[model samples]
Target chain A: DAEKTLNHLISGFETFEKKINYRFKNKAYLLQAFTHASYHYNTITDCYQRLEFLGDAILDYLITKHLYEDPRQHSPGVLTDLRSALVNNTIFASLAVKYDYHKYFKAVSPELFHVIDDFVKFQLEKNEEDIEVPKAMGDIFESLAGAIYMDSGMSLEVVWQVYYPMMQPLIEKFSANVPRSPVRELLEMEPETAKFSPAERTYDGKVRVTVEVVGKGKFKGVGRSYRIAKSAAARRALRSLKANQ
Target chain B: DAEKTLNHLISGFETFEKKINYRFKNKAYLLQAFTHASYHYNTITDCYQRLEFLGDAILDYLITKHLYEDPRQHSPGVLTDLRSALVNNTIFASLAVKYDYHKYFKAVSPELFHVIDDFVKFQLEKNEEDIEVPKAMGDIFESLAGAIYMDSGMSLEVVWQVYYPMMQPLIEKFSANVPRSPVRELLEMEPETAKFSPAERTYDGKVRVTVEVVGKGKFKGVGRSYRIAKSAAARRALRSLKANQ
Candidate 1:
């Protein structure tokens, strides 16, 4: 029984390597990545929660380093907000659904298991592997990143390089689709900019909400927080632009 | 009363200068720090709790960044715990006591007086500040750290360099006072070098217990964590060390 389980797990690893061009040094840590604390507790042993925690921090450092070093684009707060959005639940769920990962999951079905349609699975195969499609499979990426980072002794560059091909679309979409970096939004707000006075507002909701002072609000931005709100106000005005035109 | 109180406060600031040093550049933040949260809750409409929160994070960051940069250290855990102890209630209470902070506090004593001693004026400077002398004093150093970092743009080196001079004596006492670092203890107990080695040790206490695995527990390393057993082991180790040494 143990041998069959081990064989199945090893096969899963084999399939994972074939899907993504990465190899792992620590199989145990990779194994841990598949563990949720609930399942981990149900069974007796180490869980992925620790790897998840470690991976979470490692991803932050890597992402922050990437954002900070690129002075050509992101500023500190903008970079933080972007990282938050990229790691949200919607992103993780999408990544989970992409790899037909549920099929290989260790979970005993919490709900009734029924025969899945080969019909739909067949149709979705192309979408799953399609390079051009913007897959929302963010959690799978996080789990894989967690696994890979642990297996690789926390190698940031290796993690980035290994995931680069799959990640390229994400980078392209974020850069092109996410409107007006908050830093740029600040510059356009200057009173000196005559064109910006036309009340053209942009809504970058993913950006940090700059708390501002309104006469009616309980509290408003004092001088300490003025720069932040001023930045947000200018960004809001910019999002009103007719970008499709 | 107001003029004399203000003069006493100025004299207190003179001492603040002697102790906290010049990193407290923002006189406004210092003035704001003295404004009791309870005073505004009951009398005026604003208080210092909000500023205290901001100051708390800045202070933690100041100490955290200090440990982050330092190289020579045994259990880095000590650095963190020391930081927590230093920034905790005892420090704030001591400062409140040292400056006769309560002499100026005009809030009514409530049933939950001690809980809000920080927010309100206490009956006495909360005599509890002296129970753990070094730990309490370390805490005092931290609030002063909070106040200073708030004044200093949260500079890491500026805070620590000034702090280390005052803190070095306490740190030495703490290290000398606590048991050997667990990792070091483990290293010292290797079978080859250990003057005495237990063939098999079982820990059965009033609470949960754990047994050594193979050559494990070498580090006097019950050093962590699962609470009850670790404490029992630590006590046993300390007792034996006292008897033998």
Candidate 2:
């Protein structure tokens, strides 16, 4: 049964390689990319986390390079914001589902199935602002990229070629709709009524920011910096204000 | 005067290239790498921020790849910790000063000189646990790497070849001193007295962690996650306890 299962896994990977248009010279990376930590049969080392870590850095590098080289000549701050909007768990998870990479995941965790199912249902419904994306889905996409990179002898060019086409639409979409400062917008809209609390440092070295409008409930944001926390709170407040109006 | 200064700048870059043992085909990138935002003569686009952004990503990717390929077979968590310890402002700033990269920086800001002077003094004294590292000093190092990568036509091999030798000693140093959990140690030492507060999510989306000991002072930690915050608090508490003893 183990032999048969191994054969099945190999065949699936071969089909995936065809889909990606890049065949692996060493199949071990591909196998490890799909192997979840929850799988008891494989050794602890044979999981996607390490590959995901490598892949995450590779993607960031490739994406940053692409952005830096763009003729549009965005400021570093803008470029950073654009990159954040593009490279995130939600985007990666959606991309993985779009490419049907989830079908290839090998894990014994029953909860994984439920998360995937919910994600699929959310996709079909398409009503909510967000969904609880299982981190594993995003991990799979990253691990696959990592696998390809390692297989190609740590070639950035090859990984970029594979991912660029997939990422191009996202880049374009985010570039067109680059976020404006919600806090600034809120201040402009409600100069008289809105109040911003001074940024407070929390025990975890994170900044906490609060925005309250008279007659409206307080909205709170927490992040690595005061600006980030304030922005988060302002964004939430804006959303709430809009929803009511 | 402008022409003479420009010629002088070009010659200085030529000298720097000789020091690094790699000549640039495009001297403009080398010039830009050393250029700071405070230099009023150059356009904002001509500054080092964009290159620094790209370079930061490239360094992360290369470092991550190197760590992944290391025969030590470190777990993903350990790899992450190691990478964090290696890629930080203090190390980068120190390296920049070590290689005289700061001597080439083109900034008009008067305060810049003060920061550099203090850093140098700190280096000579070498007593404090930390120093206020000017962001620009670290930026210079990253921008130089960015400049090299771009000049080499975005070649990862070229960047890696340049950086890996410099990074090797640091990697070895950190590997030998990979930090154990200070929190665990504190708990073991003061199981009867130490009390941990439940992690509280702050307004800025950070976790606030607190550790208090009977007849001992309270320590606070703030971070992106509870575990990180707790670890930070624990480390601080342990340090204080040690200082008193």
Candidate 3:
């Protein structure tokens, strides 16, 4: 069993390297990328925290440069929102899972099995949208990015070549459609309230509704239609509650 | 006199070129760097705003690269604050005035003279630290940096050659010292307290003070020394007020 485990450890990362199409000059940095901070809490081990910070900046520069140079025109607000959608944890974690990075992420860690399981579970259930995956698991994508940049002799061109293909689809999706509204998105997040969930329909020749987190505070949104009123109420509730996503 | 003014303009820009040690490939781009948006406000002329936007990102990337590469090592928080200090308007305006960029910064505009003068005055006076410089004058440095990048075929390396030397001293100075507490910096911004200026001194045989603009309550920072007490008070006030810098 020990020999088998040791065999899998070396070959697993090799497979990941092949998947990414970039081999590491320093395999240690690759290992560090997947080495979550929690693993270092009880034991002395180098982790990906610092690399994640560097990776975040690297990704920012890359995306900003791409948008700025794009042939098609875009306003600053559109560019900013597009970048945010692309670079956030949801997208990166999705990529990690899609590429099977979770399966072969680490060498000897049993904890990774549980992390991988949670990631799979989260993927299946839509409720997990706002919920966070394990920090170490979520961070593997970024730390790996930092590794690629360093391993490629700090060439921005090289890193983007490896990154762009994976990112192209996500970018196009956002470009084609404006993201969903806050009220619909919020209602989706609260599935437990299924029967009593925030509802909006025609009322008094206008749209009216109550939010899911039922309380003394009631909101009535009156507009040309239910859709408009619901949007107004959702905004009012969010403002009064002072809970910003 | 027209011939003389032409000779003076070319020679003046040549001097600026010598100061920064980078001659422009595109003379028009260099001229656009100094052109103010006010030029667009009344007259049909191009301004530096778009270049300023690109330059701002370029500068951010450069500073991030420098701090990330520093062999001596630093933390993320330290690096962030240092970059903020380096790229802020005050620092940029100082660079604009230091090389006498103000001199040849597009003659024939009477409003431009007062802006250059104010920027220089701000450099000498402590009050100038908080007071904002003219948007165009301060933005000239960024616009110039942007021009260099574009003129040099979008090479980040070329922009750094022109920027890094001027920024070296400022970078080292801030890097060596521990940055000021966030509270002290915030207090420094609100100097209009008159008598209620975030008071802190020995009270009840221990240092304690309430911050100025106190509404319904106050903070007590108990420490053996006044400095410690003030810091504690400032921090406490920041937390309770849900204010962050």
Q: Can you list each candidate's DockQ? A: 0.05, 0.19, 0.07
**Clash count, candidate 2:** 14
Scored by TM against the true chain B, the candidates give: 0.47, 0.66, 0.62
In model 3, the runs with Cα more than 4 Å from the true position are A1-11, A41-45, A76-130, A133-139, A175-245, B1-12, B41-46, B87-90, B101-116, B125-130, B133-138, B179-245
Ranking by lDDT: 2, 3, 1
Off by over 4 Å in 1: A1-8, A35-45, A67-80, A110-143, A171-245, B1-245
lDDT of 1 at A223: 16
Better of 2 and 3 by TM-score: 2
Q: Is the docking of candidate 3 incorrect, acceptable, medium or high quality?
A: incorrect
Candidate 2 regions off by >4 Å?
A1-5, A43-45, A124-130, A179-245, B1-5, B43-45, B124-130, B179-245
Q: Best candidate per lDDT, number?
A: 2
lDDT of 1 by residue, B1-245 (tens): 44454444434555556554563554444544554422222211123433444344444444443433343333434654655665466554544445444433323335224544443334243433423332222233344554565566655456566656654554455445555544245335433433222212225312233334233343232321223234344445544444654
Greater-lDDT candidate between 2 and 3: 2
Q: Rank the candidates by DockQ, best first.
A: 2, 3, 1
